[PDB]
Design an enzyme around this catalytic site. Structure first.
Site, PDB file in Angstrom:
ATOM      1  N   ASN A  78      29.904  43.633  41.109  1.00 19.85           N
ATOM      2  CA  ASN A  78      30.930  42.719  40.592  1.00 19.85           C
ATOM      3  C   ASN A  78      31.972  43.403  39.734  1.00 19.85           C
ATOM      4  O   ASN A  78      32.741  42.744  39.034  1.00 19.85           O
ATOM      5  CB  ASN A  78      30.276  41.576  39.787  1.00 19.85           C
ATOM      6  CG  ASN A  78      29.244  40.841  40.599  1.00 19.85           C
ATOM      7  OD1 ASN A  78      28.050  40.898  40.304  1.00 19.85           O
ATOM      8  ND2 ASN A  78      29.698  40.147  41.645  1.00 19.85           N
ATOM      9  N   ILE A  85      36.557  43.010  36.621  1.00 22.19           N
ATOM     10  CA  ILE A  85      35.263  42.343  36.541  1.00 22.19           C
ATOM     11  C   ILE A  85      35.313  40.977  37.188  1.00 22.19           C
ATOM     12  O   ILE A  85      36.198  40.193  36.865  1.00 22.19           O
ATOM     13  CB  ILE A  85      34.836  42.147  35.064  1.00 22.19           C
ATOM     14  CG1 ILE A  85      34.760  43.478  34.327  1.00 22.19           C
ATOM     15  CG2 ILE A  85      33.517  41.398  34.961  1.00 22.19           C
ATOM     16  CD1 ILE A  85      34.668  43.304  32.772  1.00 22.19           C
ATOM     17  N   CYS A  86      34.377  40.683  38.094  1.00 23.12           N
ATOM     18  CA  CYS A  86      34.237  39.314  38.606  1.00 23.12           C
ATOM     19  C   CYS A  86      33.175  38.603  37.788  1.00 23.12           C
ATOM     20  O   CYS A  86      31.981  38.828  37.973  1.00 23.12           O
ATOM     21  CB  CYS A  86      33.857  39.313  40.095  1.00 23.12           C
ATOM     22  SG  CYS A  86      33.764  37.616  40.757  1.00 23.12           S
ATOM     23  N   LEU A  87      33.605  37.752  36.862  1.00 25.72           N
ATOM     24  CA  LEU A  87      32.688  37.002  36.019  1.00 25.72           C
ATOM     25  C   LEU A  87      33.344  35.646  35.753  1.00 25.72           C
ATOM     26  O   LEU A  87      34.484  35.609  35.310  1.00 25.72           O
ATOM     27  CB  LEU A  87      32.404  37.747  34.718  1.00 25.72           C
ATOM     28  CG  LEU A  87      31.406  37.144  33.729  1.00 25.72           C
ATOM     29  CD1 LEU A  87      30.014  37.092  34.317  1.00 25.72           C
ATOM     30  CD2 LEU A  87      31.405  37.897  32.385  1.00 25.72           C
ATOM     31  N   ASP A 118      29.032  37.062  45.412  1.00 26.44           N
ATOM     32  CA  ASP A 118      30.455  36.977  45.080  1.00 26.44           C
ATOM     33  C   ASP A 118      30.953  38.353  44.603  1.00 26.44           C
ATOM     34  O   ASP A 118      31.292  38.525  43.437  1.00 26.44           O
ATOM     35  CB  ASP A 118      30.691  35.900  44.014  1.00 26.44           C
ATOM     36  CG  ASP A 118      32.157  35.718  43.675  1.00 26.44           C
ATOM     37  OD1 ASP A 118      33.008  36.193  44.461  1.00 26.44           O
ATOM     38  OD2 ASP A 118      32.461  35.085  42.634  1.00 26.44           O
TER      39      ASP A 118
END
Length: 148
Positions: A78, A85-87, A118
């Site tokens: 992620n 950052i994918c959060l 994701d």
């Protein structure tokens, strides 16, 4: 001036109740640019590593999320090679109840429990899903090379 005031409050709270490992704050006159550091969590492949992040608060913080990115290379489904950052809390699930502190701790939980469904880096998601020991070994290899 609302944003600057909230940025100063979070700095005060953080300074007065310091975490034992992570840290964040201004590194110059510009209060809207912070550096943060997290330690690779114990009991994770990132252990012993020190990861730097760069934070840019927008001018209508806290009603829009801070922009947070790694400046240290890290192996994770992620987090991509530019450090993005994918959060979800940095995007759709942001709330003014959240703080830089809880964002860092959340990134630590992300490190310990990736979200391969994701991903920002499909190949790393693949490895995470199919061969956790290999994922752990490579994650440790990159921690030693780039974060120590």
């Amino acid at each position: 001036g609302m944003a600057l005031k909230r940025i100063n409050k979070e700095l005060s709270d953080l300074a007065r109740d310091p975490p034992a490992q992570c840290s964040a704050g201004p590194v110059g006159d510009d209060m809207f640019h912070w550096q943060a550091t997290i330690m690779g969590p114990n009991d994770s492949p990132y252990q012993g590593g020190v990861f730097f992040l760069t934070i840019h608060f927008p001018t209508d913080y806290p009603f829009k999320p801070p922009k947070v990115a790694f400046t240290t290379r890290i192996y994770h489904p992620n987090i991509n090679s530019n450090g993005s950052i994918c959060l979800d809390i940095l995007r759709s699930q942001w709330s003014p109840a959240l703080t830089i502190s809880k964002v860092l701790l959340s990134i630590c939980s992300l490190l310990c429990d990736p979200n391969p469904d994701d991903p920002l880096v499909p190949e790393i998601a693949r490895i995470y899903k199919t061969d956790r020991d290999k994922y752990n070994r490579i994650s440790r290899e990159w921690t030693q090379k780039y974060a120590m």
